Amino acid sequence: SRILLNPRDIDINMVNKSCNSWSSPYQLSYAIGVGDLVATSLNTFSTFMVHDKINYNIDEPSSSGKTLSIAFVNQRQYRAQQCFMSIKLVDNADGSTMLDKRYVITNGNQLAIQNDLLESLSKALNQPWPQRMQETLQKILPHRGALLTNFYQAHDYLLHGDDKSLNRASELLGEIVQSSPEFTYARAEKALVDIVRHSQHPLDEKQLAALNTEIDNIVTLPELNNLSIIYQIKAVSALVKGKTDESYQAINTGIDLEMSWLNYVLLGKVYEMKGMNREAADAYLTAFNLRPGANTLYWIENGIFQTSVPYVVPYLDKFLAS
Amino acid sequence: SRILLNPRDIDINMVNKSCNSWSSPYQLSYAIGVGDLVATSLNTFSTFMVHDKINYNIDEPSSSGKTLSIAFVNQRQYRAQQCFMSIKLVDNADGSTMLDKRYVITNGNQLAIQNDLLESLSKALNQPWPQRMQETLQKILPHRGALLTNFYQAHDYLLHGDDKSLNRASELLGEIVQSSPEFTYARAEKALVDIVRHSQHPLDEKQLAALNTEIDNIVTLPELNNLSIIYQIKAVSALVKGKTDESYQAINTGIDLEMSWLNYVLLGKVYEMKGMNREAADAYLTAFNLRPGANTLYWIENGIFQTSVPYVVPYLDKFLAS
């Protein structure tokens, strides 16, 4: 009956989301973005397997050898005092604390704090960060500090995936693009969001041609070479056009560049389009493993086209019911 | 209470080791070597996590989404007819068979069969093999077919790890080296075995100087560049000399090149030498995850120097008792 702990399997949890009994946007979408970045970085660039459980409200038995916990903590020195962020890495094999950070976030220092956490995690996990990871991080985060809060907000809206959330993400990204023309990645993320929005509410012919021209210009930009986002755009554009082989090629390259819940959802959608439901279900279960919860389920059920969890993904249907 | 299956966690099992109710060397050490190669290849070169349970006699609950089963099957067309090897990959999420092979092994075709299995696994798992993996496989296996059976036998003796087994491995490798001077890897594996044998039964001054000269010549050979074995030799040689920093540097490079149970045992031994028992226990638990059973436990408890599982690795002590 014994379940063996795996020291290279890590869960990320969030505790006390309601610092002031209420939420609470700002520190929270930042923390959600940090959690996603840590999970994606380790999944892509190390032999750790990370389950981002930030969006997962259930506690179940798991073989995770380590747990990274993000908690908001109030010093209670006066009413309505801002919480600080506590981040702890615990080894579940013996209960020891490997990393214990207290972070005060200041609407400006988000990248510096994140960098400190990444440096400390590298030391605690005996895990140097490879060159491609360091280069990628330089390209996928805004360096104008004033824009960070809204960038993290757009990210959280993307995770939610519904039409209203994507509409707001596109708006936020459009503002960032205007404010920071050099931050090419934001232009690419906005095109990805916009193609998905087109699948939700189809553009007229003129607007579609404009979006397609924008995609064409983006995917050839040399500074976005070697980023998963270009391949996500190529994959979603091909899915929309029903070009199955082109989408399959794109998303597998995207996955090499970024092991993320979203890339596995997109691979699932390609497999469904190919008439391969078992392979689709396997990709969707992978996505759910990487980031379990309502956000990933929303994308599985609704992203690009509708997918029946009972029919296409019966293991997950049964799991969710159990 | 639900445990979520992870589609990127794979166990490898062996069924019907006693083809003729008795063992049974030949097909068995080949199958053990194939299992180890598959696990190490996927662990090193993909985002799959593989648990090689070939040496593990217990069935426990696990989150493994897929199981690769090696089984010996007798056609029973006449008494004492040789078994063939059945290899099946099963998806535990739905019970579907992903790969189903029937292999007749002929004292010659071991590499060809293994290549077929690796090609088929690449297709079944949507997992292309990277260039470094293809190059490595060309260097770590003998290409003189007549030597394969004994090479796999030496490998199994290495896994066992006790003094008599290593003595026999060294002998077998010495014969291979004489028969195949070009197969430089065998010379490196023999030096690794021989340094470990020296930790078991120390060589006199003259013989130690000869071994150290041999190590010096081996580690500079350009064709063994980019192979974990050179770093394993460097790490074990430094451990024997009590050079902790040199050993730590070597084994971490070795791990980058090969995610294997043996490299994590060696990292554990370095951490113990550094006075870092918690980090050692974590490395040892990693090794046990990669290849659970008596062989890995033997190396944890006895490799290079003696290690108390109750004191140094209490989680594993308790697990084994539970």
PDB file of N, CA, C and O in Angstrom, chain B residues 1-59:
ATOM      1  N   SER B   1      -9.187  11.109  -2.002  1.00  0.00           N
ATOM      2  CA  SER B   1      -8.372   9.849  -1.986  1.00  0.00           C
ATOM      3  C   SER B   1      -7.826   9.476  -3.376  1.00  0.00           C
ATOM      4  O   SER B   1      -6.882   8.689  -3.496  1.00  0.00           O
ATOM      5  N   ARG B   2      -8.424  10.051  -4.416  1.00  0.00           N
ATOM      6  CA  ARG B   2      -8.023   9.813  -5.807  1.00  0.00           C
ATOM      7  C   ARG B   2      -6.551  10.185  -6.053  1.00  0.00           C
ATOM      8  O   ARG B   2      -6.108  11.254  -5.635  1.00  0.00           O
ATOM      9  N   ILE B   3      -5.797   9.280  -6.684  1.00  0.00           N
ATOM     10  CA  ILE B   3      -4.422   9.549  -7.137  1.00  0.00           C
ATOM     11  C   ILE B   3      -4.447   9.831  -8.651  1.00  0.00           C
ATOM     12  O   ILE B   3      -4.921   9.009  -9.410  1.00  0.00           O
ATOM     13  N   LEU B   4      -3.932  10.977  -9.087  1.00  0.00           N
ATOM     14  CA  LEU B   4      -3.992  11.328 -10.507  1.00  0.00           C
ATOM     15  C   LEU B   4      -2.885  10.637 -11.295  1.00  0.00           C
ATOM     16  O   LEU B   4      -1.702  10.800 -10.968  1.00  0.00           O
ATOM     17  N   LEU B   5      -3.239   9.875 -12.333  1.00  0.00           N
ATOM     18  CA  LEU B   5      -2.197   9.286 -13.201  1.00  0.00           C
ATOM     19  C   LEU B   5      -1.405  10.340 -13.970  1.00  0.00           C
ATOM     20  O   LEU B   5      -1.970  11.300 -14.484  1.00  0.00           O
ATOM     21  N   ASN B   6      -0.091  10.133 -14.081  1.00  0.00           N
ATOM     22  CA  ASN B   6       0.761  11.038 -14.840  1.00  0.00           C
ATOM     23  C   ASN B   6       1.189  10.366 -16.146  1.00  0.00           C
ATOM     24  O   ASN B   6       1.954   9.402 -16.108  1.00  0.00           O
ATOM     25  N   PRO B   7       0.693  10.852 -17.304  1.00  0.00           N
ATOM     26  CA  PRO B   7       0.980  10.165 -18.561  1.00  0.00           C
ATOM     27  C   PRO B   7       2.452  10.210 -18.950  1.00  0.00           C
ATOM     28  O   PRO B   7       2.868   9.504 -19.868  1.00  0.00           O
ATOM     29  N   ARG B   8       3.229  11.057 -18.287  1.00  0.00           N
ATOM     30  CA  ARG B   8       4.651  11.136 -18.615  1.00  0.00           C
ATOM     31  C   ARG B   8       5.528  10.441 -17.567  1.00  0.00           C
ATOM     32  O   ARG B   8       6.740  10.605 -17.557  1.00  0.00           O
ATOM     33  N   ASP B   9       4.889   9.655 -16.704  1.00  0.00           N
ATOM     34  CA  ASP B   9       5.602   8.792 -15.760  1.00  0.00           C
ATOM     35  C   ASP B   9       5.387   7.349 -16.217  1.00  0.00           C
ATOM     36  O   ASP B   9       4.249   6.907 -16.362  1.00  0.00           O
ATOM     37  N   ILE B  10       6.476   6.615 -16.429  1.00  0.00           N
ATOM     38  CA  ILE B  10       6.414   5.281 -17.022  1.00  0.00           C
ATOM     39  C   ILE B  10       7.150   4.312 -16.096  1.00  0.00           C
ATOM     40  O   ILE B  10       8.234   4.632 -15.617  1.00  0.00           O
ATOM     41  N   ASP B  11       6.556   3.147 -15.842  1.00  0.00           N
ATOM     42  CA  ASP B  11       7.284   2.065 -15.144  1.00  0.00           C
ATOM     43  C   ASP B  11       7.688   1.020 -16.162  1.00  0.00           C
ATOM     44  O   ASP B  11       6.955   0.749 -17.125  1.00  0.00           O
ATOM     45  N   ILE B  12       8.830   0.379 -15.923  1.00  0.00           N
ATOM     46  CA  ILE B  12       9.212  -0.777 -16.725  1.00  0.00           C
ATOM     47  C   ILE B  12       9.201  -1.998 -15.797  1.00  0.00           C
ATOM     48  O   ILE B  12       9.836  -1.968 -14.747  1.00  0.00           O
ATOM     49  N   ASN B  13       8.467  -3.051 -16.178  1.00  0.00           N
ATOM     50  CA  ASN B  13       8.348  -4.272 -15.378  1.00  0.00           C
ATOM     51  C   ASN B  13       8.841  -5.464 -16.185  1.00  0.00           C
ATOM     52  O   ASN B  13       8.847  -5.434 -17.425  1.00  0.00           O
ATOM     53  N   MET B  14       9.235  -6.522 -15.481  1.00  0.00           N
ATOM     54  CA  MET B  14       9.587  -7.771 -16.139  1.00  0.00           C
ATOM     55  C   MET B  14       8.713  -8.870 -15.580  1.00  0.00           C
ATOM     56  O   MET B  14       8.557  -8.990 -14.368  1.00  0.00           O
ATOM     57  N   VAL B  15       8.139  -9.656 -16.489  1.00  0.00           N
ATOM     58  CA  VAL B  15       7.235 -10.760 -16.139  1.00  0.00           C
ATOM     59  C   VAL B  15       7.766 -12.088 -16.695  1.00  0.00           C
ATOM     60  O   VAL B  15       8.290 -12.141 -17.821  1.00  0.00           O
ATOM     61  N   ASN B  16       7.654 -13.148 -15.891  1.00  0.00           N
ATOM     62  CA  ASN B  16       8.041 -14.511 -16.304  1.00  0.00           C
ATOM     63  C   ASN B  16       9.543 -14.659 -16.566  1.00  0.00           C
ATOM     64  O   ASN B  16       9.956 -15.267 -17.570  1.00  0.00           O
ATOM     65  N   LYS B  17      10.349 -14.101 -15.659  1.00  0.00           N
ATOM     66  CA  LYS B  17      11.810 -14.263 -15.688  1.00  0.00           C
ATOM     67  C   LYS B  17      12.253 -15.729 -15.781  1.00  0.00           C
ATOM     68  O   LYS B  17      13.320 -16.012 -16.331  1.00  0.00           O
ATOM     69  N   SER B  18      11.447 -16.638 -15.238  1.00  0.00           N
ATOM     70  CA  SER B  18      11.755 -18.066 -15.255  1.00  0.00           C
ATOM     71  C   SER B  18      11.079 -18.775 -16.425  1.00  0.00           C
ATOM     72  O   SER B  18      10.213 -19.628 -16.229  1.00  0.00           O
ATOM     73  N   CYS B  19      11.478 -18.418 -17.643  1.00  0.00           N
ATOM     74  CA  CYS B  19      10.931 -19.045 -18.842  1.00  0.00           C
ATOM     75  C   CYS B  19      10.751 -20.546 -18.644  1.00  0.00           C
ATOM     76  O   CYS B  19       9.676 -21.091 -18.894  1.00  0.00           O
ATOM     77  N   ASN B  20      11.812 -21.209 -18.196  1.00  0.00           N
ATOM     78  CA  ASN B  20      11.774 -22.647 -17.960  1.00  0.00           C
ATOM     79  C   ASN B  20      11.730 -22.980 -16.473  1.00  0.00           C
ATOM     80  O   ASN B  20      12.350 -23.944 -16.025  1.00  0.00           O
ATOM     81  N   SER B  21      10.994 -22.176 -15.713  1.00  0.00           N
ATOM     82  CA  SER B  21      10.879 -22.377 -14.274  1.00  0.00           C
ATOM     83  C   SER B  21      12.221 -22.154 -13.584  1.00  0.00           C
ATOM     84  O   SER B  21      12.309 -22.164 -12.357  1.00  0.00           O
ATOM     85  N   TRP B  22      13.263 -21.951 -14.384  1.00  0.00           N
ATOM     86  CA  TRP B  22      14.603 -21.725 -13.856  1.00  0.00           C
ATOM     87  C   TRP B  22      15.341 -20.659 -14.659  1.00  0.00           C
ATOM     88  O   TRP B  22      15.073 -20.463 -15.845  1.00  0.00           O
ATOM     89  N   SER B  23      16.274 -19.973 -14.005  1.00  0.00           N
ATOM     90  CA  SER B  23      17.068 -18.942 -14.661  1.00  0.00           C
ATOM     91  C   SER B  23      18.542 -19.332 -14.697  1.00  0.00           C
ATOM     92  O   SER B  23      19.117 -19.716 -13.678  1.00  0.00           O
ATOM     93  N   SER B  24      19.150 -19.232 -15.875  1.00  0.00           N
ATOM     94  CA  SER B  24      18.449 -18.764 -17.064  1.00  0.00           C
ATOM     95  C   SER B  24      19.132 -17.529 -17.642  1.00  0.00           C
ATOM     96  O   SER B  24      18.466 -16.613 -18.126  1.00  0.00           O
ATOM     97  N   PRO B  25      20.471 -17.504 -17.594  1.00  0.00           N
ATOM     98  CA  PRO B  25      21.267 -16.381 -18.074  1.00  0.00           C
ATOM     99  C   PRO B  25      21.394 -16.364 -19.595  1.00  0.00           C
ATOM    100  O   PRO B  25      21.604 -17.411 -20.212  1.00  0.00           O
ATOM    101  N   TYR B  26      21.266 -15.175 -20.178  1.00  0.00           N
ATOM    102  CA  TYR B  26      21.403 -14.976 -21.625  1.00  0.00           C
ATOM    103  C   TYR B  26      20.353 -13.966 -22.102  1.00  0.00           C
ATOM    104  O   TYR B  26      20.643 -12.752 -22.249  1.00  0.00           O
ATOM    105  N   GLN B  27      19.136 -14.464 -22.313  1.00  0.00           N
ATOM    106  CA  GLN B  27      18.010 -13.637 -22.711  1.00  0.00           C
ATOM    107  C   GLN B  27      17.698 -12.662 -21.581  1.00  0.00           C
ATOM    108  O   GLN B  27      17.368 -11.488 -21.827  1.00  0.00           O
ATOM    109  N   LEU B  28      17.812 -13.155 -20.346  1.00  0.00           N
ATOM    110  CA  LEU B  28      17.532 -12.341 -19.174  1.00  0.00           C
ATOM    111  C   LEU B  28      18.496 -11.159 -18.989  1.00  0.00           C
ATOM    112  O   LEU B  28      18.038 -10.042 -18.771  1.00  0.00           O
ATOM    113  N   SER B  29      19.814 -11.363 -19.044  1.00  0.00           N
ATOM    114  CA  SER B  29      20.661 -10.171 -18.858  1.00  0.00           C
ATOM    115  C   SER B  29      20.537  -9.212 -20.035  1.00  0.00           C
ATOM    116  O   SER B  29      20.663  -8.010 -19.851  1.00  0.00           O
ATOM    117  N   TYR B  30      20.251  -9.737 -21.231  1.00  0.00           N
ATOM    118  CA  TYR B  30      19.956  -8.861 -22.372  1.00  0.00           C
ATOM    119  C   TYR B  30      18.731  -7.994 -22.067  1.00  0.00           C
ATOM    120  O   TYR B  30      18.783  -6.778 -22.216  1.00  0.00           O
ATOM    121  N   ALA B  31      17.644  -8.621 -21.622  1.00  0.00           N
ATOM    122  CA  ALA B  31      16.417  -7.896 -21.332  1.00  0.00           C
ATOM    123  C   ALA B  31      16.625  -6.873 -20.219  1.00  0.00           C
ATOM    124  O   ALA B  31      16.094  -5.757 -20.287  1.00  0.00           O
ATOM    125  N   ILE B  32      17.403  -7.245 -19.203  1.00  0.00           N
ATOM    126  CA  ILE B  32      17.766  -6.289 -18.146  1.00  0.00           C
ATOM    127  C   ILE B  32      18.525  -5.093 -18.722  1.00  0.00           C
ATOM    128  O   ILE B  32      18.281  -3.944 -18.333  1.00  0.00           O
ATOM    129  N   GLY B  33      19.443  -5.344 -19.656  1.00  0.00           N
ATOM    130  CA  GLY B  33      20.213  -4.256 -20.274  1.00  0.00           C
ATOM    131  C   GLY B  33      19.345  -3.358 -21.149  1.00  0.00           C
ATOM    132  O   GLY B  33      19.531  -2.136 -21.172  1.00  0.00           O
ATOM    133  N   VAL B  34      18.397  -3.965 -21.864  1.00  0.00           N
ATOM    134  CA  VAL B  34      17.479  -3.193 -22.738  1.00  0.00           C
ATOM    135  C   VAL B  34      16.612  -2.284 -21.864  1.00  0.00           C
ATOM    136  O   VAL B  34      16.455  -1.103 -22.163  1.00  0.00           O
ATOM    137  N   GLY B  35      16.091  -2.839 -20.773  1.00  0.00           N
ATOM    138  CA  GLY B  35      15.257  -2.072 -19.853  1.00  0.00           C
ATOM    139  C   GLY B  35      16.018  -0.879 -19.282  1.00  0.00           C
ATOM    140  O   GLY B  35      15.497   0.242 -19.212  1.00  0.00           O
ATOM    141  N   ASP B  36      17.262  -1.113 -18.879  1.00  0.00           N
ATOM    142  CA  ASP B  36      18.085  -0.055 -18.301  1.00  0.00           C
ATOM    143  C   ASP B  36      18.352   1.023 -19.356  1.00  0.00           C
ATOM    144  O   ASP B  36      18.243   2.230 -19.081  1.00  0.00           O
ATOM    145  N   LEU B  37      18.674   0.587 -20.574  1.00  0.00           N
ATOM    146  CA  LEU B  37      18.939   1.531 -21.659  1.00  0.00           C
ATOM    147  C   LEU B  37      17.736   2.391 -22.017  1.00  0.00           C
ATOM    148  O   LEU B  37      17.884   3.600 -22.225  1.00  0.00           O
ATOM    149  N   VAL B  38      16.562   1.767 -22.102  1.00  0.00           N
ATOM    150  CA  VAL B  38      15.326   2.503 -22.361  1.00  0.00           C
ATOM    151  C   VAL B  38      15.052   3.539 -21.249  1.00  0.00           C
ATOM    152  O   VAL B  38      14.807   4.712 -21.539  1.00  0.00           O
ATOM    153  N   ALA B  39      15.142   3.110 -19.996  1.00  0.00           N
ATOM    154  CA  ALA B  39      14.845   3.995 -18.865  1.00  0.00           C
ATOM    155  C   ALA B  39      15.834   5.163 -18.886  1.00  0.00           C
ATOM    156  O   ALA B  39      15.424   6.320 -18.782  1.00  0.00           O
ATOM    157  N   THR B  40      17.124   4.861 -19.043  1.00  0.00           N
ATOM    158  CA  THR B  40      18.152   5.893 -18.955  1.00  0.00           C
ATOM    159  C   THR B  40      18.033   6.863 -20.115  1.00  0.00           C
ATOM    160  O   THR B  40      18.134   8.089 -19.923  1.00  0.00           O
ATOM    161  N   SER B  41      17.772   6.318 -21.301  1.00  0.00           N
ATOM    162  CA  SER B  41      17.569   7.148 -22.497  1.00  0.00           C
ATOM    163  C   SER B  41      16.404   8.130 -22.318  1.00  0.00           C
ATOM    164  O   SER B  41      16.552   9.336 -22.566  1.00  0.00           O
ATOM    165  N   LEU B  42      15.248   7.623 -21.873  1.00  0.00           N
ATOM    166  CA  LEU B  42      14.078   8.501 -21.695  1.00  0.00           C
ATOM    167  C   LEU B  42      14.297   9.491 -20.553  1.00  0.00           C
ATOM    168  O   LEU B  42      13.940  10.669 -20.657  1.00  0.00           O
ATOM    169  N   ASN B  43      14.924   9.026 -19.473  1.00  0.00           N
ATOM    170  CA  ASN B  43      15.158   9.947 -18.354  1.00  0.00           C
ATOM    171  C   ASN B  43      16.100  11.080 -18.727  1.00  0.00           C
ATOM    172  O   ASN B  43      15.923  12.223 -18.276  1.00  0.00           O
ATOM    173  N   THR B  44      17.079  10.767 -19.568  1.00  0.00           N
ATOM    174  CA  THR B  44      18.123  11.722 -19.912  1.00  0.00           C
ATOM    175  C   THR B  44      17.673  12.667 -21.004  1.00  0.00           C
ATOM    176  O   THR B  44      17.999  13.862 -20.961  1.00  0.00           O
ATOM    177  N   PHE B  45      16.923  12.137 -21.972  1.00  0.00           N
ATOM    178  CA  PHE B  45      16.682  12.871 -23.226  1.00  0.00           C
ATOM    179  C   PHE B  45      15.250  13.289 -23.501  1.00  0.00           C
ATOM    180  O   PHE B  45      14.942  13.755 -24.612  1.00  0.00           O
ATOM    181  N   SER B  46      14.372  13.128 -22.531  1.00  0.00           N
ATOM    182  CA  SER B  46      12.954  13.490 -22.729  1.00  0.00           C
ATOM    183  C   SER B  46      12.399  14.019 -21.422  1.00  0.00           C
ATOM    184  O   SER B  46      13.088  14.010 -20.384  1.00  0.00           O
ATOM    185  N   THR B  47      11.150  14.483 -21.451  1.00  0.00           N
ATOM    186  CA  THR B  47      10.508  14.881 -20.224  1.00  0.00           C
ATOM    187  C   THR B  47       9.716  13.737 -19.596  1.00  0.00           C
ATOM    188  O   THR B  47       8.987  13.952 -18.627  1.00  0.00           O
ATOM    189  N   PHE B  48       9.861  12.510 -20.109  1.00  0.00           N
ATOM    190  CA  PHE B  48       9.301  11.368 -19.380  1.00  0.00           C
ATOM    191  C   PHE B  48      10.141  11.085 -18.139  1.00  0.00           C
ATOM    192  O   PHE B  48      11.361  11.281 -18.173  1.00  0.00           O
ATOM    193  N   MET B  49       9.486  10.629 -17.068  1.00  0.00           N
ATOM    194  CA  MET B  49      10.167  10.104 -15.879  1.00  0.00           C
ATOM    195  C   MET B  49       9.958   8.589 -15.910  1.00  0.00           C
ATOM    196  O   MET B  49       8.819   8.114 -15.930  1.00  0.00           O
ATOM    197  N   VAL B  50      11.049   7.843 -15.906  1.00  0.00           N
ATOM    198  CA  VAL B  50      10.946   6.376 -15.989  1.00  0.00           C
ATOM    199  C   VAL B  50      11.493   5.703 -14.740  1.00  0.00           C
ATOM    200  O   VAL B  50      12.582   6.044 -14.280  1.00  0.00           O
ATOM    201  N   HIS B  51      10.697   4.793 -14.178  1.00  0.00           N
ATOM    202  CA  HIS B  51      11.099   3.951 -13.069  1.00  0.00           C
ATOM    203  C   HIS B  51      11.352   2.556 -13.610  1.00  0.00           C
ATOM    204  O   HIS B  51      10.415   1.871 -14.043  1.00  0.00           O
ATOM    205  N   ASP B  52      12.625   2.150 -13.608  1.00  0.00           N
ATOM    206  CA  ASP B  52      12.997   0.804 -14.026  1.00  0.00           C
ATOM    207  C   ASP B  52      12.764  -0.131 -12.856  1.00  0.00           C
ATOM    208  O   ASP B  52      13.563  -0.156 -11.916  1.00  0.00           O
ATOM    209  N   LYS B  53      11.681  -0.902 -12.924  1.00  0.00           N
ATOM    210  CA  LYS B  53      11.291  -1.815 -11.832  1.00  0.00           C
ATOM    211  C   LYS B  53      11.628  -3.285 -12.142  1.00  0.00           C
ATOM    212  O   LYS B  53      11.078  -4.210 -11.524  1.00  0.00           O
ATOM    213  N   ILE B  54      12.542  -3.487 -13.086  1.00  0.00           N
ATOM    214  CA  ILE B  54      12.956  -4.829 -13.489  1.00  0.00           C
ATOM    215  C   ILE B  54      13.512  -5.633 -12.302  1.00  0.00           C
ATOM    216  O   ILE B  54      13.282  -6.859 -12.211  1.00  0.00           O
ATOM    217  N   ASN B  55      14.212  -4.941 -11.398  1.00  0.00           N
ATOM    218  CA  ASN B  55      14.813  -5.552 -10.194  1.00  0.00           C
ATOM    219  C   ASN B  55      13.942  -5.383  -8.946  1.00  0.00           C
ATOM    220  O   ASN B  55      14.414  -5.547  -7.811  1.00  0.00           O
ATOM    221  N   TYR B  56      12.676  -5.053  -9.130  1.00  0.00           N
ATOM    222  CA  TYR B  56      11.820  -4.749  -7.997  1.00  0.00           C
ATOM    223  C   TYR B  56      10.672  -5.734  -7.896  1.00  0.00           C
ATOM    224  O   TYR B  56       9.769  -5.725  -8.725  1.00  0.00           O
ATOM    225  N   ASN B  57      10.681  -6.530  -6.837  1.00  0.00           N
ATOM    226  CA  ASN B  57       9.731  -7.643  -6.704  1.00  0.00           C
ATOM    227  C   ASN B  57       8.389  -7.285  -6.054  1.00  0.00           C
ATOM    228  O   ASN B  57       7.573  -8.174  -5.798  1.00  0.00           O
ATOM    229  N   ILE B  58       8.154  -6.000  -5.794  1.00  0.00           N
ATOM    230  CA  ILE B  58       6.925  -5.581  -5.119  1.00  0.00           C
ATOM    231  C   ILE B  58       6.003  -4.702  -5.982  1.00  0.00           C
ATOM    232  O   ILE B  58       6.466  -3.874  -6.776  1.00  0.00           O
ATOM    233  N   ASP B  59       4.694  -4.902  -5.822  1.00  0.00           N
ATOM    234  CA  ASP B  59       3.684  -4.112  -6.522  1.00  0.00           C
ATOM    235  C   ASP B  59       3.061  -3.114  -5.556  1.00  0.00           C
ATOM    236  O   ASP B  59       2.505  -3.496  -4.520  1.00  0.00           O
TER     237      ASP B  59
END
